[PDB]
């Protein structure tokens, strides 16, 4: 996954 801000 990923933070969306990243």
């Amino acid at each position: 996954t990923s933070p969306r801000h990243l």
Partner: antibody
Amino acid sequence: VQLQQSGPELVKPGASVKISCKTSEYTFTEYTKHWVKQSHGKSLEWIGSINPNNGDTYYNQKFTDKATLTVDKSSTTASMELRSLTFEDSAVYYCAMGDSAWFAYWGQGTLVTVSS
Amino acid sequence: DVQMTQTPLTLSVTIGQPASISCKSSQSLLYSNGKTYLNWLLQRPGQSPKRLIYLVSKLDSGVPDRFTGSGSGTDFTLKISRVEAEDLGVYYCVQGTHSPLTFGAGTKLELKR
């Protein structure tokens, strides 16, 4: 790969300015692009980040005051318009890669001098 | 905003000796997918940042191996076992689990000769 930042800018106090960043290879145009401000002699601050796919923008609340992030239709150029510029806005502004390439590639410019 | 306390602020190292830089955070950097988004960057003056460590411990593609990164949760450390002239500049930690992204103040590494 590269990020290619627009060049040095002289901007009167009160005006606005737009700084661009071109991706060299098609393969990185989809990636999230980050924007970081380094004041002279100083450390680094995060301005925000744009998703070239859909356009979603995520800002550091300190800069909603001041920064708009867009992308051209190709998503090959991510821009930053700094509105209503104060002397404290003189700095270097970087453009950096995101997603699984988070902060692996950085642009080179851009120096902004706010002065009359 | 996650506060990132980097220590020491300056470093002076005889070449061949090791270096160490610590990064402490006000919040945990563990993300709900089990990955911790903490990078180590190097900046030589005038130039732009280069990445050295990502996800706390992974070396980036070109980086020498005397660089290592460790830690978890709120304490992280970058270690250089043998420092050389090339390693000069300003080392930052940066976290990206939480928003806004926040950087350490920096660490100027100075070589002794």
